[PDB]
Design an enzyme around this catalytic site. Structure first.
Site, mmCIF file in Angstrom:
data_model
loop_
_atom_site.group_PDB
_atom_site.id
_atom_site.type_symbol
_atom_site.label_atom_id
_atom_site.label_comp_id
_atom_site.label_asym_id
_atom_site.label_seq_id
_atom_site.Cartn_x
_atom_site.Cartn_y
_atom_site.Cartn_z
ATOM 1 N N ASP A 245 -0.173 -7.435 2.266
ATOM 2 C CA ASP A 245 0.359 -6.087 2.060
ATOM 3 C C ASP A 245 1.887 -6.125 2.049
ATOM 4 O O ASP A 245 2.560 -5.710 2.997
ATOM 5 C CB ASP A 245 -0.174 -5.180 3.160
ATOM 6 C CG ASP A 245 0.167 -3.735 2.949
ATOM 7 O OD1 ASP A 245 0.489 -3.379 1.800
ATOM 8 O OD2 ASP A 245 0.102 -2.963 3.941
ATOM 9 N N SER B 194 4.534 3.463 7.478
ATOM 10 C CA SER B 194 3.947 2.486 6.576
ATOM 11 C C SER B 194 5.072 1.717 5.896
ATOM 12 O O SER B 194 6.036 2.310 5.396
ATOM 13 C CB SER B 194 3.054 3.174 5.545
ATOM 14 O OG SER B 194 1.802 3.530 6.116
ATOM 15 N N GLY B 195 4.977 0.390 5.937
ATOM 16 C CA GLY B 195 5.997 -0.472 5.381
ATOM 17 C C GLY B 195 7.164 -0.777 6.304
ATOM 18 O O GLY B 195 8.021 -1.579 5.927
ATOM 19 N N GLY C 75 6.084 3.570 13.767
ATOM 20 C CA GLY C 75 6.403 2.807 12.566
ATOM 21 C C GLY C 75 5.858 3.499 11.323
ATOM 22 O O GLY C 75 4.685 3.877 11.271
ATOM 23 N N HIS D 133 0.806 -1.228 0.000
ATOM 24 C CA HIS D 133 0.000 0.000 0.000
ATOM 25 C C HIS D 133 0.838 1.276 0.000
ATOM 26 O O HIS D 133 0.265 2.369 -0.068
ATOM 27 C CB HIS D 133 -0.963 0.020 1.196
ATOM 28 C CG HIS D 133 -0.350 0.491 2.486
ATOM 29 N ND1 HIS D 133 0.211 -0.376 3.403
ATOM 30 C CD2 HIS D 133 -0.254 1.728 3.036
ATOM 31 C CE1 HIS D 133 0.643 0.307 4.451
ATOM 32 N NE2 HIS D 133 0.379 1.587 4.251
#
Lengths: 241, 241
Positions: B102, B191-192, B189, B57
């Site tokens: 994801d 994203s990813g 954190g 995403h």
């Protein structure tokens, strides 16, 4: 376009809580998007007999089917058209992390047969101004995600993006528009479903459902793809394909 | 892999509120993902000198750059490696509407030079069992999305998916895992970015950041891509490219 053969009836109950049931066939551009298995996952809107507009974050592919003419998803009795998708055109500016420019076009393999219950919504010009406070309508089977299986509708007012930022902060971009927080929920709209406003006797597509309140709050607006910002891309895509 | 040359120091403050600052270079697989303009938009983890694993995403493309060896995103003084991306491998099972599966792999154009501050996290076997209640660590610059520009860390416990459903309901799928809601936020954190747990003296990648509490609640867990469910696909991709 934009003039249903079966006219919508919108009562005061469309303004509060979770909206109300629509008159069958009164939103004739509304389609359901089903995957390979018949599972309804997104909404969309017919813009002519060969093209459906929906949201890019739905991730539609050519193994999904467009279902037109539907009212009661629990009835195997009503006349519907299950239409195959020949090609998917995701807006290349789509940012899958901010959900900005959240629009995709679907070109059908065979044309839908337009009728009293299947016909096209009007698209706006890029320069149209839909002012804050305008009452608009969202429709869909979005409440099944949590419950009635018949098409629902709600009336809710547009917000300026400045006022929408009070709710959602920096996630609101220019190609977005917000509506609601007026004491009615926005969750009846499916992802990719329509937000339409009545301009000069015709219903025009102003927004496409992007996301809403994670709890279906009656005091939190829905966020939509702003169709004025994306309609030039829509018309360029139709002309080249 | 999984053994930093500069050992992490984790105090009681990593367990509450928003975590605490990391020791510089102590999370050597952590990379920053920057777009064409130098804007940091996602995290990721080195798994060897040629490959970074991140979330699908994030929508990474080959015009983005991987930035390794970073600690202070406000310092133009520290030794870093800006690495070009040659190819992006998005997991084909990724469902952009539920954010399930994801995961995306990035193959670098030129190898990173591994050092004391740049090295690889360990991947789990598909059959590894990380039990509910295990303390794990998430790291990133995710608090800049709202504020320190130095790398942060937090300690937070894994949840069983059943217990995670009490918070997130039906959005929790099998290829997902949750952690937190223990009085510390998960929003540091990116994203990813990584969620790692220490198995037999080595740090192993257990999750990839998918989404968290929209208000960075200390009582709402983060949701991660469950790496055990996706590591076979990771190894198949490395072997074929």
């Amino acid at each position: 376009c934009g003039v249903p053969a079966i006219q919508p009836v919108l009562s005061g109950l469309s303004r509060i809580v979770n909206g109300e049931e629509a008159v069958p066939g009164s939103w004739p551009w509304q389609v359901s998007l089903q995957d390979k298995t018949g599972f309804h996952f997104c909404g969309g809107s017919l813009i002519n007999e060969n093209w459906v507009v929906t949201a890019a974050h739905c991730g539609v592919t050519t193994s999904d089917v467009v279902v037109a003419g539907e009212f009661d998803q629990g009835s195997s009795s009503e006349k519907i058209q299950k239409l195959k998708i020949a090609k998917v055109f995701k807006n290349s500016k789509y940012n899958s992390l901010t959900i900005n420019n959240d629009i995709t076009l679907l070109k059908l393999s065979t044309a839908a047969s337009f009728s009293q219950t299947v016909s096209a919504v009007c698209l706006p010009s890029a320069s149209d101004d839909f002012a804050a406070g305008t009452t608009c309508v969202t429709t869909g089977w979005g409440l099944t995600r949590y419950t009635p299986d018949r098409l629902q509708q709600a009336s809710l007012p547009l917000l300026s993006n400045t006022n929408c930022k009070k709710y959602w902060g920096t996630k609101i971009k220019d190609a977005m528009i917000c509506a609601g927080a007026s004491g009615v929920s926005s969750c009846m709209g499916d992802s990719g479903g329509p937000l339409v406003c009545k301009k000069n006797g015709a219903w025009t597509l102003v927004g496409i459902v992007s996301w809403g309140s994670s709890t279906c709050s009656t005091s939190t607006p829905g966020v939509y793809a702003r169709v004025t910002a994306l309609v030039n891309w829509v018309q360029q895509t139709l002309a080249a394909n």
